């Protein structure tokens, strides 16, 4: 903490919810490539270590435009070709079925 850096806005309450399929507006990456490295160890684009998910291995980030020191990282989505359910809510969809 610094006492010379005040914060004006504070959190008062936390709502719980479910992310719906508007992840598409959120994440515009669509991680498809199952290969995570290559030869020469570089991140292959479309893989899990893609450079639009944050800076990595002394690369600038694709979306953040910042190095590892200042990027937050960003979330990527995997398209599932079918609606696989959620094992959190499974015992409760099994009751409404």
């Amino acid at each position: 903490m610094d006492i010379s850096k005040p914060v004006g806005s504070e959190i008062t309450s936390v709502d719980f919810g479910i992310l719906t399929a508007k992840i598409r507006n959120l994440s515009a990456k669509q991680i498809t490539n199952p290969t995570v490295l290559d030869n020469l160890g570089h991140p292959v684009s479309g893989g899990l270590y893609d450079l639009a998910l944050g800076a990595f291995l002394r690369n600038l980030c694709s979306t953040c435009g910042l190095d590892e020191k200042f990027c937050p990282g960003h979330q990527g989505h995997i398209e599932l070709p079918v609606p696989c359910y959620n094992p959190l809510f499974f015992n409760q969809l099994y009751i409404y079925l």
Partner: protein, 107 residues
């Protein structure tokens, strides 16, 4: 002091529309401009123009990432003071599909 101010105190950015930690982004501007912090899912992309009898954007609602994608809207952010594990908590609940919404009521 022993659990926030001297362990993992991070001043993070939060959108005051969707109430989220991880959807914010600082844009990749012109080199003759200033970057600002913008939400992603509150921002609608610039290939969603729909139509004083007409609309036109005030040139400051439009921001870009380094991928080149323009986005309209997605502003209304501010900075809060959270522990850093609450970022790691939020991301490891998104991987379960769970959305935490934060209400930043002193604004």
């Amino acid at each position: 002091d022993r659990l926030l101010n001297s362990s993992d105190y991070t001043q993070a950015s939060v959108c005051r529309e969707c109430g989220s930690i991880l959807t914010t982004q600082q844009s990749v501007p012109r080199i003759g401009s200033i970057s600002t912090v913008c939400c992603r899912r509150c921002s609608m992309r610039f290939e969603d123009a729909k139509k004083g009898e007409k609309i036109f954007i005030d040139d400051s609602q439009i921001w870009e990432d380094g991928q080149g994608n323009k986005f309209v809207g997605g502003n209304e952010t501010t900075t809060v003071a959270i522990p850093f594990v609450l970022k790691y908590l939020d991301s490891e609940l998104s991987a379960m599909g769970i959305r935490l919404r934060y209400n930043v009521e002193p604004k």
